[PDB]
Write an enzyme that holds these catalytic residues in place. Structure first.
Site, mmCIF file in Angstrom:
data_model
loop_
_atom_site.group_PDB
_atom_site.id
_atom_site.type_symbol
_atom_site.label_atom_id
_atom_site.label_comp_id
_atom_site.label_asym_id
_atom_site.label_seq_id
_atom_site.Cartn_x
_atom_site.Cartn_y
_atom_site.Cartn_z
ATOM 1 C CB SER B 349 40.574 32.139 47.159
ATOM 2 O OG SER B 349 40.844 33.260 47.618
ATOM 3 N NE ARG B 350 36.132 34.709 40.556
ATOM 4 C CZ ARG B 350 35.870 34.850 39.474
ATOM 5 N NH1 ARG B 350 36.377 35.775 38.732
ATOM 6 N NH2 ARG B 350 35.263 33.786 38.991
ATOM 7 C CB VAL B 351 42.092 37.270 47.488
ATOM 8 C CG1 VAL B 351 43.422 38.098 48.173
ATOM 9 C CG2 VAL B 351 40.739 38.049 47.274
#
Ligand SMILES: Nc1ncnc2c1ncn2[C@@H]1O[C@H](COP(=O)(O)OP(=O)(O)OP(=O)(O)O)[C@@H](O)[C@H]1O
Ligand SMILES: [Mg+2]
Lengths: 469, 485, 469
Positions: B349-351
């Site tokens: 995940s990049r969040v």
């Protein structure tokens, strides 16, 4: 004025006809007064019967056969000046921050020829960055192309932020940021953090200009945003007489959009599906990023490697131009050291005794030897243990762990989330600080004293303060 | 009258070439004699390329074709909740007509930089392997990627089904409405999915949009945009939505069919040049809007089907580049009883932490570190005995945690039930428990916690954060169980 | 009548020019009364200039430019109903058995639209097939859709014949067998056995309808016979309301026949060489094979996998249309383990505890876990050997070799070329046997006792026989 009529609309491609017999030149910009804003088209081919084929800078939906098109007399013209700072500019030079027009005195074409051979800088030169791992093992070049390999999850945005802070504030200068197919969420986040960090101010001076070409935009825009920001960087070079740095995020999408526009224009696809003009397009972008007598436009380019294949033509072609690499790898944050730069996959062309000095080359080489010796023994350390190692290799692994940790650094911008105060280190204070570790002077000290400390003069103090606790 | 009404020159394979229609707008709809509808995708110097939404048998050369003046649009509103609708909003469930608050175009432009706000609130899936290792936020775009028959629809549907604990609530800020876009699926699969959602009472907050296999390729290409426009109503009215696309590979196949029959030149893997522009202007219509624009959110979960596990294919390579993260499902994990078969190493995940429940974050950090250590040592997993002490310990803990992350289908968990379990795993308590009994553990422990230690669950739920006064009592309450177990 | 003249002939494609404006509709049937016997053409597209392009349901040999063609007024119409029982029908509906005309009240088009979403009905019942691997690891649904995926030489025709012997007589309802590019010898071998076993009483009541396109027939026929079988099955589903089972062998040939003709129809080819319309041309047929509120159709489809490449577009698209899929693989056949089903790639919607029971579900899960543990250790066993493995893993490997061998089962139709007489094994017996094996009761019996036997009692009997040797 030169007025034409539309004859075809196929996706992002539009054909225009000029019955008056004065055709527009290639790379010229034409305008259609659409109900929403205006639609800009860049001429890409002359096809005869006074017909020209053009790539759209916005959605072509709603177009009608027989709509007027007006020639602007030149290529897409971006605004340039100090009035661009703090603003967010799109590919066509229009503000998208809702904060009014840009009152610039001048506008500059996005298409310009690189500097001649007679004008180039004669010698390489080092960019003092303030990050140990960068300016010890993979130092950056003034007026060069630096390639950042890593996702958002590994600290990419905060690395760009710290570069913008250290180079532009401690040393002095302006900066340009160019989102070529950037995710819109990341761009809002970057704008918000830059407001939080004081690079952008609305009611006062600001020192970074933003050009954003969103991923939702058609291929013709993503293929041209990079030039939109590069032209502003070049203006601050040649008309502000100062060194600037240009961020392109991500350079892969320049080639991706080039491939889209080539396929749409009917050019035969090459290898895995890229345009034949791939190397020449990358050249006509990169070779404007160079040092000249008036200054240097430096570039830090994020490079998306599809499927982790460094042999894909996009990264393979990008690598030919950039000479410093900075790999942000998950395999380093998984064990909890930030910046999270791989000391071994990251490399630089400028790590040469004739540039950095022999004292620095020796230290860097012995670091890349200790870390690599450690990375050789890991199977042995796992299946067996650290007792089986020789007393030599036990010391090597100790100093390798200490070095691995000492390459970590607290950013002056991480003060909010991590709380850690943040510091920057000079190249001397780093080279000598690692020389002292390799020379075994501080082998008495535990590894934890190296973890988030900007220089050994503070590692001593952390050791003392931990032992006193 | 050629400006309004053209003549068909040629027709076949779902593509008609019409003469006239000098004033037709790109992507405008045309109505043929016999009522069949079509979309004008190609505007050429002397002819127009219409893609037919129906069977081509009805269209014949010489057919008068009259323009509508309407870019394709679909109805939107809350009355769509609980309904199955085609790619154009027409009801196919037979319960009757749709009541609509309005109509919205398919290919509207996504929101820009300025109106958004950062993702900071969770899309609680109830799956341990996701909420604790690859969190999904409201405003995010997470690609569920994997080979055939690997668990993707199960993930999306457990995410749908777990919202029942909030959507019955009165607090409109927590309830998340759902849209499911079945592209290329057979009608019987949608029948079974609606059965599952009806059994669980999830239909009352779910809209299903079905461009099934027998549907003309234009409608399979168009359905995702119309479903997005349906969710965008909830976004623009301060509500929250989750749009699942199952799946975008088949939309790409339909777009390829359309393009090739329109004689556009192919690119890689026979696909058209502008498929990236097809999916991009679909996905990042998902957004998290700021208070100025109503605080709404639309969350996208696009599915992709990887042949032979190859992410080097064109459409996977594209969509992996558009999304904010990926849940990678792999079959070697499925057959080993790791279900859902999420490869925690390939998934990302990049969040990140911003999207995570705070209590689950406080433990997912260590969970991720330990599973990384396990991924490193795993090559030596089988010959566990002869390894070093630390490697043996890492293998033990990682295997116990990997077993800990499994859970049954259609059995999502609350975070109040996830936190204690990931805590007992991280903090080493489970090391003494044989690898086969972990299934007996998470079942018998929660039942214990719910019975004898309810205030811990109540506070984990209400307060959202693990306080020290509470973390110590959780340690106590886990020791007071592993002893009897 | 509406009449025209042939203007082109290219393989199976024929172009027809109509001298007046009344052109025939697409999918209509045109007739040529060539003295060698009439030839039927299906209108595929309107080329323009009063020309239509059509696909030939029979050999185009002998066609002359200028030859008259006449419109029949509608699509290919096949006879439907009870009088189709016990008879063999061609694509165009004519009999290829010599028993004279199919006297029927209704003839019905082969092109019809699939059932709506409101007409669908979802069953959950298990079809006891008598085959261990299927009934255990991938139970077939009654009223569902079944695929037997398999390359050349893996044995799926014997699987189809076993399914016919086992299911078709206990079904009680009506049956339709559609041959699509299969062997004519194995059509005669089916006609003969159905005639001996009484399901085809030439001079009495019959309960199976045969439709035979075969690999000798042109592509236009292979591409359209499946629709004739579907039409008969759909009449039995809707008009008679009876329970129906539809056998299609092999449905890959439909897509292949479309591919053969696509290039001559004038279409740009897609991926590895198939037509654009693969996914939708397939769907229009496949979605008609389904159960409805009016009646139930149980569908067994054979799906050829070319070059053993399960990733070929055709199988990859077919997998989405089936509730149960058994993938026959060549490796399991080289190992001697007929019926060669890959225990892992085979999957079924019904393998859930709500349907098969928790005992059954857990047994199947333990079988899969054992076999996947065996397949993960194969490299180790190849290079290192079994000595390195742990104590649990040696046992798991022995047990995996027993299990994979116990999934073998001899078929009563395969005895002629295998010699081993046939075995039918009940579902409960299979679950109990694999449970007893997993629980370790038979670690004292060698692997050879499990090969090509039925239940566990036969394992014991063969163990005693081998011991007595
Ligand atoms: N967590 C789980 N536990 C047990 N079984 C599961 C789980 N998740 C999925 N399955 C099983 O896996 C099978 C596939 O489910 P799913 O529909 O999610 O696959 P898919 O990814 O949609 O593949 P496709 O859509 O190509 O069929 C189902 O039969 C289901 O029973
Ligand atoms: Mg699915």
């Amino acid at each position: 004025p030169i007025t034409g009529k539309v004859t075809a609309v196929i996706g992002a491609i539009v054909d225009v006809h000029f019955e008056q017999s004065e055709l527009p030149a290639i790379l010229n910009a034409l305008e259609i007064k659409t109900p929403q804003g205006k639609l800009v088209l860049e001429v890409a081919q002359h096809l005869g019967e006074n017909t020209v084929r053009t790539i759209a800078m916005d959605g072509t939906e709603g177009l009608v056969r027989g709509e007027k098109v007006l020639d602007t007399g030149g290529p897409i013209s971006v605004p340039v000046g100090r009035e661009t700072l703090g603003r967010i500019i799109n590919v066509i030079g229009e503000p998208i921050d809702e904060r009014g027009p840009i009152k610039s005195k001048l506008r500059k074409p996005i298409h310009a020829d690189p500097p001649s051979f007679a004008e180039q800088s004669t010698s390489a030169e080092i960019l003092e960055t303030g990050i140990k791992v960068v300016d010890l093992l993979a130092p950056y070049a003034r007026g060069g192309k630096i390639g950042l390999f890593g996702g958002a999850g590994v600290g990419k945005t905060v690395f760009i932020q710290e570069l913008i802070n250290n180079i532009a504030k401690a040393h002095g200068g302006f900066s340009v940021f160019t989102g070529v197919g950037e995710r819109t969420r990341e761009g809002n986040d970057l704008y918000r953090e830059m407001k939080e960090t004081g690079v952008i101010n609305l009611e006062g001076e600001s020192k970074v200009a933003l050009v954003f070409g969103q991923m939702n935009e058609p291929p013709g825009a993503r293929a041209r945003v990079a030039l939109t920001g590069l032209t502003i960087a070049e203006y601050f070079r040649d008309e502000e007489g100062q060194d600037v740095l240009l961020f392109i995020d991500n350079i892969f999408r320049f080639t991706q959009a080039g491939s889209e526009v080539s396929a749409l224009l009917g050019r035969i696809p090459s290898a895995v599906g890229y345009q034949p003009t791939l190397a020449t397009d990358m050249g006509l972008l990169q070779e404007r990023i160079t040092t000249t007598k008036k200054g240097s436009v430096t570039s830090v380019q994020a490079v998306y490697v599809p499927a982790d294949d460094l042999t894909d033509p996009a990264p393979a072609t990008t690598f030919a131009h950039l000479d410093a690499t900075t790999v942000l790898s998950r395999g380093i944050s998984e064990l909890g050291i930030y910046p999270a730069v791989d000391p071994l996959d990251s490399k630089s062309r400028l790590l040469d005794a004739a540039v950095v000095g022999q004292e620095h080359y020796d230290v860097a080489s012995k670091v890349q030897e200790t870390l690599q010796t450690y990375k050789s023994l890991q199977d042995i350390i796992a299946i067996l243990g650290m007792d089986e190692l020789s007393e030599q290799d036990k010391l090597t692994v100790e100093r390798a762990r200490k070095i691995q940790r000492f390459l970590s650094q607290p950013f002056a911008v991480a003060e909010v989330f991590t709380g850690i105060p943040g510091k920057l280190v000079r190249l001397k204070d780093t080279v000598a600080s690692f020389k002292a570790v390799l020379e075994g002077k501080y082998d008495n000290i535990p590894e934890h004293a190296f973890y988030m400390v900007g220089g050994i003069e503070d590692v001593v103090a952390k050791a003392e303060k931990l032992a006193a606790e | 009258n050629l400006n309004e009404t053209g003549r068909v020159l040629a027709v076949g394979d779902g593509i008609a070439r019409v003469f006239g229609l000098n004033n037709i707008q790109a992507e405008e709809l045309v109505e043929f004699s016999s009522g069949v509808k079509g979309m004008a995708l190609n505007l050429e110097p002397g002819q127009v390329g219409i893609v037919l939404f129906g069977s081509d048998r009805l269209v014949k050369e010489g057919e008068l074709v009259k323009r509508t003046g309407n870019i394709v649009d679909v109805p939107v509103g809350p009355g769509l909740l609980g309904r199955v609708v085609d790619a154009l909003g027409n009801p196919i469930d037979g319960k009757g007509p749709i009541d609509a608050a309005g109509r919205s175009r398919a290919q509207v432009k996504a929101p820009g930089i300025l109106p958004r706000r950062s993702v900071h609130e969770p899309v609680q899936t109830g799956l341990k392997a996701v909420d604790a290792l690859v969190p999904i936020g409201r405003g995010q775009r997470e690609l569920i990627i994997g080979d055939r028959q690997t668990g993707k629809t199960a993930v999306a549907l457990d995410t749908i089904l777990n919202q029942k604990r909030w959507n019955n609530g009165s607090d409109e800020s927590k309830k998340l409405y759902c849209v499911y876009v079945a592209v290329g699926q057979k009608r019987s699969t949608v029948a079974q999915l609606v059965q599952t959602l009806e059994q669980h009472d999830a239909m009352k907050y779910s809209i299903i949009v079905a461009a099934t296999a027998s549907e003309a390729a234009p409608l399979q290409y168009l359905a995702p945009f119309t479903a997005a426009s349906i969710g965008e109503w909830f976004r623009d009215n301060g509500k929250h939505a989750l749009i699942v696309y199952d799946d975008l590979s088949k939309q790409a196949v339909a777009y390829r069919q359309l393009s090739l029959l329109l004689r556009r030149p192919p690119g890689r893997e026979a696909y058209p040049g502008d498929v990236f522009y097809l999916h991009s202007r679909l996905l990042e219509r998902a957004a998290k809007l700021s208070e100025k624009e109503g605080s709404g959110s639309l969350t996208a979960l696009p599915v992709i089907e990887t042949q032979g596990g190859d992410v080097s294919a064109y459409i996977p390579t594209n969509v992996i580049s558009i999304t904010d993260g990926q849940i990678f499902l792999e079959a070697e994990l499925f057959y080993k009883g790791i279900r859902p078969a999420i490869n925690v190493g390939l998934s990302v995940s990049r969040v990140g932490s911003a999207a995570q429940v705070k209590a689950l974050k406080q433990v997912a950090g260590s969970l991720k570190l330990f599973l990384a250590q396990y991924r490193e040592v795993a090559a030596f997993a089988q010959f566990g005995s002869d390894l070093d002490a630390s490697t043996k310990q890492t293998l033990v803990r990682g295997e116990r945690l990997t077993q800990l992350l499994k859970q049954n289908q259609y059995s999502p968990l609350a975070t109040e039930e996830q936190v204690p379990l990931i805590y007992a795993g991280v903090n080493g308590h489970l090391d003494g428990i044989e690898l086969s009994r972990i299934g007996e553990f998470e079942s018998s422990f929660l039942s214990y916690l719910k019975s004898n230690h309810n205030e811990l669950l109540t506070e984990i739920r209400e307060k959202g954060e693990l306080s020290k006064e509470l973390l110590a009592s959780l340690k106590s309450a886990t020791e007071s169980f592993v002893a009897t177990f």
